[PDB]
């Protein structure tokens, strides 16, 4: 019997499992209950701490995936299936995972806590691409990841009501962070060195924990990959949250908030999922029905206002983007786009694309977008149009919100490091024109190329190892840099320096699309106001 | 008496003078009356045709400059003085000039007619830089230029009134064009081949003759240099014209505001010209560079709609047009009020001074619109670099007032029938007295067009004499054929799509694309949607 796989946490005893890597074994504890199952009368409610159990919880395999839409755009395509549930769906899904060196550390080891993305409507901690074994073995941290409720189960809100208060998916994450504070030491982890990292809606979630005081005591550093709490998709106002909740009820045959939530609670989970997308105000890409709501509780103001007001002295943050943030999203409803052709679009398609990738803004606003992003010497060239619509979607949704966050944090006391991830994986199954798409730096950060059963090059493995070193350096010290040999300088509102991450050594550059982001961050708000 | 210097025109007999040029003799008839002096009761009225006369009028020197403000910014400085009146000021100023080859052409010769600029508040056909003797000698065209009233005398308008209808300085120009039709043949010119060219407000004036049906019949081709009738400074609406006219009258004691129009104008007419001039700049809405008190008014008469609308709505088949700009249209205007600018230093302005300049150079737009200008013209990787800020403010002023209005005119005309040729003038004259940072400023292509470097009293290089002869050749080629190309690299037409134009400098023609295309999309496409909403 292996005593390295036996662990007692406050609620009871756990039996973990030993995992293999090309670098030696790792201890893993998968499927640890951290909340009471949020089912029946507990749907839409805040998570309750998991009650103590007797006997041994079997933590040798991943647990169920929180109920969510399953992507059917390209059935069986690698590039989409890698994000789909790889366990059975269930509302009984609040479990977290711990990987730790083997044998377990006997001195406090810094903790990395992963929060998955998926637009707040999808995702799981069990995806192959989130496999913690390579990071833990290589950089000897403790790694934790949790499932949190998504879609209406996590974010349906009738503001004011006790029955559906909103943001419970965010509370799921906070409970898991509390859990870590109370129990990570039993695994060799150091609760005083906890670094949050997340991608897309996971990065948005990380920033929201930054801006919400009751979370802020639960971690010490923060990594934001390709997402930001101020992104225009990441939050919704109270009024609009009430309208969307109300339309879901009508769509599934339900009628006073108490009566409304009660009837919603009688419906099978799959029925809510089936209808969730039909509550969005217009046709779009990059917009999601149930998201964090600004209501004074979890978020006392908008993430924007909160970022501007904050004193961020003492904070170290790592943030960045992939080279082509917008391309992936275009195949989900921009006229003329497909992964299976060159997507060489017409000016009229571009024009229609813009109202899809920049939803719910005025005509005048859309015109301003077309002005900035048209090359008026080549207004109708298909290739340039495809690239320009990709820039529109990427800039609006990811790059410029991340740029705004980095500038305001650095200017208000934080130490910020910025990257652009520019390496196209040799194994990438999306077409060439998509470039380096959204989400394809994750497999490198988690060191998936080290898996021999996969087909990365020798150079991609050396690359993964570099990235894993930067990230773990940052978690340990607040500074990704390796000792002087080329150095990764802090990002500042003035010099705006960041580094390129690819097979070549670090290259220092200026401006996260500064010209484009002045448009979105400086001009466009003035316009919508006045 | 010498036969070549005697001509009979419909009004009576004229006597002229023989001019010496480097390349040989020219006949000039300077200071020909074409209107009754718009004096006393005739102030603010349309010009009356000059009554016939007996005996011989001596047309042997330039007549007086129309009453106008005289620039005092840099007194004695060449760069400003070259534009100031070089004859006495008078309201008696409605004379024109004809230069012709010596001896007088045997067969009908193409006519170039010149319309000076000066913001509609200044200018004169007698300026040295408009000396027609070199063009006529080199290219054997007939050259005509006229004086027309400026400032309040030309453009004060109380719309609807009989006593001050407005646009009379444009009517002065039309009368001169009518004069050319009826008389140019007596000088050996061809009234069926008449090409208007003007610079700045003269180019705006040329464009307005295009868009006013009674003018349009008096010429066949058009050349617009650094100016366009759709420029934001070039016209005013009826209500604002009246407001300005009314404020002017008030500021000089008329009446002892508004009231009967006839009484107000009669009181205006009793004021000395110099008094009107002294007060004319106090009627502008805000302080600005590039805005002028009395300019053409859109009132349904001379102009039946705004120049924009008329341009958009027009059929221009059978028309050839040559248009262009200088390399640095805006720089000249900045030393007249933009904070931090002077000809006598580097004008390395601050960010605060740049922002403040955007309001002066783009006057009377909302804060939202100003914000949008700052967005487009700031380099956000270098938001505070003084040199860059200087250059950008020059671009702002240049693009808004000259380049994008011309670009818009060029594109619509191409699209709607006309053959268009476009240039950018890029040579900085060896004699230029303005500082190096101003580059190639507004108006400094003119002296090459008129072949002034051939003047032996001036100290131009030999290459500049060659270059000036090239330019003269293009303009006259265009006037003869509607095509500036030698009937050497070719000058292609301008089109809304390929947007091709040539650079004019000491090097041979180079073909390039887009007249500040990115910048002008902002001014010509987006910004007007902002003003609606
Ligand atoms: C590139 O593909 C898009 C997407 O169309 C889909 O994928 C193709 C590979 C093919 O299998 C189509 O049948 C699919 O519908 C094309 O845009 C579509 O054009 C068809 C024309 O009948 C239209 O009915 C669809 O609505 C369009 N889809 C979208 C999303 O706009 C596009 O035409 C292709 N480019 C080409 C052919 O040059
Ligand atoms: C560059 O010059 C401007 C213009 O000022 C005049 O021209 C100078 C060459 C010199 O002769 C000055 O003495 C003149 O007054 C300067 O802007 C002026 O600055 C003064 C204060 O020092 C102020 O009172 C004026 O209003 C300013 N005028 C404008 C149009 O802004 C400018 O500061 C000079 N830049 C330098 C010297 O670096
Ligand atoms: N009917 C539904 O519940 C539903 C839910 C989610 N989506 C989103 O699927 C597309 N998508 C899938 C993966 C990543 C991004 C995107 C882009 N969305 O805009 C569609 C329908
Ligand atoms: N009548 C007036 O008071 C007056 C004052 C100022 N201005 C314009 O100021 C000079 N200026 C300003 C901008 C460009 C050129 C010039 C040169 N003028 O001759 C005109 C009239
Ligand atoms: C203005 O005064 C004149 C002069 O007596 C007179 O005809 C009338 O009162 C007014 N004229 C017009 C046209 O209104």
Residue A481 near residue A505, CB atoms below 8 Å: no
Q: In degrees rounded to 5, what are phi and psi of residue B412?
A: -60, -40
Q: How far is CA A371 from the centre of its chain?
A: 31
Q: Is B446 exposed, middle or buried (0-12, 13-18, 19+ CB in 10 A)?
A: buried
Contact partners, residue A325, CB within 8 Å, separation at least 6:
A226, A393, A394, A395, A397, A398, A399, A437, A438
Query: What is the DSSP-derived secondary structure letter of residue B51?
Result: P
**Nearest CB to A515; choose among B380, B514, B533:** B380
Q: With contact defined as beta carbons under 8 Å apart, do B316 and B417 qualify?
A: yes
By C-alpha distance, the chain B residue nearest A366 is: B526
CB contact under 8 A, B525 and A371: yes
Q: If you compute the radius of gyration of chain A from its CA atoms, what whole number of angstroms results? A: 22
Q: What HEC string does B354-390 produce?
A: HHHHHHHHCCCCCHHHHHHHHHHHCCCCCCCCHHHHH
Most ligand 1 atoms within 8 A of CB, residue of A329, A334, A336 to mutate: A336
Residues in contact with A172: Cβ distance below 8 Å, sequence separation at least 6, in sequence order: A35, A47, A94, A146, A147, A148, A149, A154
Ligand nearest to the CA of A84: 3
CA B187/CA A282 separation, integer angstroms: 73
Report the sign of the C-alpha dihedral through residues B468, B474, B475, B477, in that order.
Answer: positive
Q: Which of A64, A122, A200, A215 is catalytic?
A: A200
* C-beta separation of A335 from A355 below 8 A: no
Of all residues in chain A, the one with the smallest CA distance to B366 is: A530
* Nearest ligand, measured from the Cα of B350: 2
Burial of B135 (0-12, 13-18, 19+ CB in 10 A): buried
CA distance between the termini of chain B = 70
Residue A496 at interface with chain B, using a CB cutoff of 8 Å: yes
Report CA-CA distances (Å) from B497 to A379, B415, B418: 9, 9, 14
**Closest ligand to Cα B153:** 4
Helix (H) or strand (E) holding B9: strand B6-9
Q: Please name which of B499, B498, B500, B502 lies closest in space to residue B485, comparing C-alpha atoms.
A: B502
Distance from CA of B388 to the nearest CA of A (A): 15
Q: In sequence order, which residues have a C-beta less than 8 Å from that of residue A203 and are 6 or more positions away?
A: A115, A117, A223, A224, A225, A226, A227, A228, A319, A402
Q: With contact defined as beta carbons under 8 Å apart, do B394 and B340 qualify? A: no
Interface probe, candidates A372, A374, A376, A526, chain B, greatest B C-beta count within 10 A: A376
Q: Exposed, middle or buried, B213 (CB in 10 Å: 0-12/13-18/19+)?
A: exposed
| Dihedral class, residue A478 (left if φ above 0, else alpha if ψ from -120 to 50, else beta) | left
Q: Which CATH number does the domain housing residue B2 bear?
A: 3.40.50.1820
Nearest CB neighbour to B533, from listed A364, A376, A519 = A364
Q: Which of A120, A128, A119 is nearest to A81 (CA)?
A: A128
**Ligand 1 centroid to residue A336 C-alpha, Å:** 6
Atom of ligand 1 nearest to the CA of A340: 9
Laid out side by side, the sheet with A507-510 consists of A17-19, A26-33, A95-101, A142-146, A109-115, A189-199, A221-225, A316-322, A415-421, A497-501, A507-510
Is residue B463 within 8 A of residue B470, CB to CB? The reply is no
Q: Assess whether the previous peptide bond of B103 is cis (omega < 30° from 0).
A: yes
Residue B525: its chain A contacts at CB < 8 A?
371
Strand duo A95-101 + A56-58: pairing: unpaired
Q: Which of B211, B234, B205, B83 is nearest to B146 (CA)?
A: B205
Question: Closest Cα partner for A203 from A86, A286, A115?
Answer: A115
Joined together, the tokens standing for residue B309 give 């609308």
> Given A325, A422, A441, A460, which residue is catalytic?
A325
Question: What is the 3-state composition of chain B as percent helix, strand, coil, each rounded to the nearest 5?
Answer: 40, 20, 45
What DSSP character marks residue A333? Answer: T
Q: Which residues pair with B95 in a beta bridge?
A: B33
* Closest-approaching ligand to the CA atom of B339: 2
**Contact indicator for A458, A446 with CB cutoff of 8 Å:** no
The token duo for B491 is: 């000058």
CA dihedral (B232, B237, B243, B244) in degrees, to 10, reads: 40
The method of structure determination was: X-ray
- Token pair of B429 as six digits: 């004259």
Q: Which of A101, A74, A76 is nearest to A16 (CA)?
A: A101
Three-state DSSP state, A225: strand
- Closest residue on chain B to A520 (Cα): B375
CB A295 within 8 A of CB A238: yes
Give the A:B interface size as CB pairs under 8 Å. 48
- Which residue in chain A has the smallest CA separation from B531? A364
Residue A186, CA distances (Å) to A13, A195, B261 in order = 11, 18, 96
Selected for mutation to probe chain A from B351, B371, B498, B521 (highest A CB count within 10 Å) is B521
Distance CA B453, CA B450 (A): 9
Phi, psi of A237 (to 5 degrees): -75, 160
Nearest to B382 by CA among A379, A135, A515, A71: A515
Phi, psi at residue B316, to the nearest 5°?
A: -125, 25
Max CA separation in chain B (angstroms): 73
Provide φ and ψ at B155, rounded to 5°: -140, 5
Q: ω into residue B132 within 30 of 0, thus cis?
A: no
- As given in the structure block, the two tokens for residue A494 are 């003035």
> What distance in angstroms lies between residue A433's CA and the mean position of ligand 3's atoms?
21
B530 interfaces chain A, CB cutoff of 8 Å: yes
Q: Do residues A191 and A181 lie in contact, with contact meaning Cβ atoms separated by under 8 Å? A: yes
DSSP letter string over A97-134?
EEEEESSPPSS-EEEEEEE--STTT---TT-GGG-THH
Nearest CA to ligand 3 atom 1: A277
Query: Is B442 a known active-site residue?
Result: yes
Confirm or reject contact between A511 and chain B (CB < 8 A): yes
Letter string b/e over residues A303-329, b meaning 16 or more CB atoms within 10 A of that residue's CB? bbebbeebebeebbbbbbbbbbbbbbb
**CB nearest to B372's CB, from A376, A517, A523:** A523
Tokens of A375: 């090359």
What are the two backbone dihedrals, phi and then psi, of residue A404, each rounded to the nearest 5 degrees?
-60, -45
The resolution in angstroms reads 2.2
Residue A413's SS3 state is: coil
Decide: B357 in ligand 2 pocket, CB within 6 A. Answer: no
CB proximity list for A85: less than 8 A, separation 6 or greater: A65, A68, A70, A124
Answer whether A308 touches B (CB < 8 Å): no
Burial A345-363 (b: 16+ CB within 10 A, else e): beeebbbbbbbbbbbebee
A365 phi and psi angles, rounded to 5 deg:
-65, -45
Give the gyration radius of chain B's Cα atoms: 22
Contact B198, B234 (CB under 8 A): no
Point out the catalytic residue in the list B163, B308, B329, B391.
B329
Count of structural domains, chain A:
1
A25, A100 contact by CB (below 8 A)? no
- Within 13 A of A359's CA, how many CA atoms are on the CB side? 15
Chain B residues with CB-CB distance to A400 below 8 A = none
- Is A330 buried (19+), middle (13-18) or exposed (0-12) by CB count in 10 A? buried
- Distance between CA atoms of residues A69 and B207, nearest Å: 63
3-class secondary-structure state, position B350: coil
Query: Domain residues for B144?
Result: 1-533
B430 given a catalytic annotation: no
> CA-CA distance, B7 to B188, in Å (whole number)?
10
Under a CB-based contact definition with an 8 Å cutoff, are residues B151 and B276 in contact?
yes
Peptide bond into A103 cis (omega under 30): yes
Q: How far does the centroid of ligand 3 lie from the alpha carbon of residue A71, in Å? A: 7
CB A292 within 8 A of CB A238: no
Q: Cβ-count burial of A112 within 10 angstroms (0-12 exposed, 13-18 middle, 19+ buried)? A: buried
Q: Which residues of A touch B522 (CB under 8 A)?
A: 371
Question: Which residues of A line the annotated binding site for huperzine A?
Answer: 83, 130, 328
Q: How far apart are the first and last CA of chain A?
A: 70
**Any chain A CB within 8 A of the CB of B514?**
yes
Where b means 16+ CB within 10 Å and e means fewer, B215-236 reads beebbbbbbbbbbbbbbbbbbb
Assign residue B495 a region: left if phi > 0, alpha if psi is -120 to 50, beta otherwise? beta
Chain mean position to CA B336: 19
**Helix ranges (DSSP H) in A374-431:** 382-394, 400-411
Please, what's the b/e burial string for B486-498 (b: 16 or more CB within 10 A of its CB; e: otherwise)?
A: eeeeebebbeeee
């Amino acid at each position: 019997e292996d005593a390295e796989l036996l662990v007692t946490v406050r609620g009871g005893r756990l039996r973990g499992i030993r995992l293999k890597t090309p670098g030696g074994p790792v201890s893993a504890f998968l499927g640890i209950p951290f909340a009471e199952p949020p089912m029946g009368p507990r749907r839409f409610l805040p998570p309750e701490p998991k009650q103590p159990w007797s006997g041994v919880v079997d933590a040798t395999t991943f647990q169920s995936v929180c109920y969510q839409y399953v992507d059917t755009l390209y059935p069986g395509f690698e590039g989409t299936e890698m994000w789909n549930p790889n366990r059975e769906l269930s509302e009984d899904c609040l479990y977290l995972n711990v990987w730790t060196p083997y044998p377990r550390p006997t001195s406090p080891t810094p903790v990395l806590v992963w929060i998955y993305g998926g637009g707040f409507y999808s995702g799981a901690s069990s995806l192959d691409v989130y496999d913690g074994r390579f990071l833990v073995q290589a950089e000897r941290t403790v790694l934790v990841s949790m499932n949190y409720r998504v879609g209406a189960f996590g974010f349906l809100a009738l503001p004011g009501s006790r029955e559906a208060p909103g943001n419970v998916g965010l509370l799921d994450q906070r409970l898991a962070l509390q859990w870590v504070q109370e129990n990570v030491a039993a695994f060799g982890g150091d609760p005083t060195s906890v670094t949050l990292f997340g991608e897309s809606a996971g990065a948005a979630s990380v920033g929201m924990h930054l801006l919400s005081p009751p979370s802020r005591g639960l971690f010490h550093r923060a990594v934001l990959q390709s997402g930001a709490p101020n992104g225009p998709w990441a939050t919704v106002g109270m009024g609009e949250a009430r309208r969307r909740a109300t339309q879901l009820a009508h769509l599934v045959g339900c009628p006073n908030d108490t009566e409304l939530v009660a009837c919603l609670r009688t419906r099978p989970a799959q029925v809510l999922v089936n209808h969730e997308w039909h509550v969005l105000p217009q046709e779009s890409v990059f917009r999601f029905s149930f998201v964090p709501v600004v209501d004074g509780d979890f978020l006392s103001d908008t993430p924007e206002a909160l970022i501007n007001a904050g004193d961020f002295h003492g904070l170290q943050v790592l943030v960045g983007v992939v080279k082509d943030e917008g391309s992936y999203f275009l195949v989900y409803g921009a006229p003329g786009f497909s992964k299976d052709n060159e997507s060489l679009i017409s000016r009229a398609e571009f024009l229609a694309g813009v109202r899809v990738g920049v939803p719910q803004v005025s005509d005048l606003a859309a015109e301003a977008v077309v002005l900035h992003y048209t090359d008026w010497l080549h207004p109708e060239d298909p290739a340039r149009l495809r690239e320009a619509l990709s820039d529109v979607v990427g800039d609006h949704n990811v790059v410029c919100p991340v740029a705004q966050l980095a500038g305001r944090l650095a200017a208000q006391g934080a130490r910020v490091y910025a990257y652009v991830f520019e390496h196209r994986a040799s194994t990438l199954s999306w077409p060439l024109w998509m470039g380096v798409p959204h989400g394809y730096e994750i497999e490198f950060i988690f060191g998936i190329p080290l898996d021999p059963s996969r087909n990365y090059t020798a150079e991609e493995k050396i690359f993964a190892q570099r990235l894993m070193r930067y990230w773990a350096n940052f978690a340990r010290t607040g500074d990704p840099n390796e000792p002087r040999d080329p150095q990764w300088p802090p990002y500042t509102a003035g010099a705006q320096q960041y580094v390129s991450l690819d097979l070549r050594p670090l290259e220092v550059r200026r401006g996260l699309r500064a010209q484009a982001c002045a448009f979105w961050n400086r001009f466009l708000p003035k316009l919508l106001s006045a």
